[PDB]
Amino acid sequence: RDGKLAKPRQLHNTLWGMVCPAETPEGHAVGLVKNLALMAYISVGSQPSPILEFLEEWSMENLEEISPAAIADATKIFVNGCWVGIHKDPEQLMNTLRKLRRQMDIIVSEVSMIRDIREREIRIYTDAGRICRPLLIVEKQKLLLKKRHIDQLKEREYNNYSWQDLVASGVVEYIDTLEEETVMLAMTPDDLQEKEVAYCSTYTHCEIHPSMILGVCASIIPFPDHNQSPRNTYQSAMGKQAMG
Amino acid sequence: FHYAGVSAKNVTLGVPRLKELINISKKPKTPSLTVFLLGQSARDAERAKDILCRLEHTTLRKVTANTAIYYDPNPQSTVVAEDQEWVNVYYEMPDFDVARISPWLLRVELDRKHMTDRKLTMEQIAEKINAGFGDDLNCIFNDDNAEKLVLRIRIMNSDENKMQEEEEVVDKMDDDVFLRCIESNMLTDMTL
Amino acid sequence: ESRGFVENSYLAGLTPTEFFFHAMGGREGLIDTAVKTAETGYIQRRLI
């Protein structure tokens, strides 16, 4: 807290959807103590062995003969660190990995797979610290979530349909910050996915609701978009002090 | 930040500038010097630009488009095709080749835009380099009319012939390593 | 819109991206205040 540098305290762009922008202490700890967003989840950790076995089965020749070769072998498959080889086809590998994430065979919902098309690296991180959030999945310009899923969830009790079934269906997906860097998001399905003057026609995901970017204390603020930003921080601090 | 941009020059203000003044720091964050012009140069923009050029530090790196080192066995050989003409001209009445000539050639090529912005002259640059380094560095300069501004630098003629050194016949820093050292020194320290 | 301009008024209500950018600006102001206190206090003590 003693350090007066105003760099580590500032609200970074990558905090979007994973740490509350409003809720921070004021004083020596401005921007150094943070609070999770409402829908944020933190990876618990998993064994990388099944992912490595799948990669070995698909291709990912390791101990190759200087095959990167100006990255002619597109992408180098990384895991939690540990360059484990490279593949010639990166896009088929990425699509197969996403399908496996849906079927939940080798990739738990928390396994994070990032391909950097330029610089040609795929990272595949499962390291127990990553903070991720649920995002709906957009195929073409249509949300995968449909009326069947919403009707079953509406009957949630005595229908034995839950959020985990929504994840298993492939409707929603957990995305961490590194994957948020490689994903085209829509705030709302209707306003953004639908055809208009085309800003983007390659949305890959959709926010479940924008208001989930706030935390617990900032979620009680009514009409928070109509207040000045420091006032929402003040209200978070004061709502931690209300009597009830 | 939020300082009004009257001019394109940043200035420390507020608490940090008060700290600098109060501490009498030897190194200001933004040391600046306001210069007022005495004569008609204040009124006329071209003379003011001349003063600005005279007051602004300019290294050879700032006006150099690209530098190369070619091993040229003979001056007449002209390994680079382009210099074949002007080298010939300079070797129609060769000067300082009596001792010897260096087998290595530093063929610096200057950007015309930077040269004309700083209003530098090929003779000016050549004089600075040759005089400051001495007779060791011999420079051949192109005409400004030529499309490429080329300065051909060679190591000491007497040092190449080794009659002047006498002592022991042992290469010091070879020649190409010495030429690279010279190139770095010119790039960062010419102060044209 | 991409780089932070908020065209909506407070009464109209900020859109979500504008909301996050506004939060970034307010955070910078708060950090400035908090950092300012200590440096100014040290200067004042030295002068006195």
């Binding site: - | 009004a4 | 600006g25 102001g29």
Partner: peptide, 8 residues
């Protein structure tokens, strides 16, 4: 939060 010349 206003502009570049104002406040954040």
């Amino acid at each position: 939060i206003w502009g570049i010349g104002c406040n954040p």
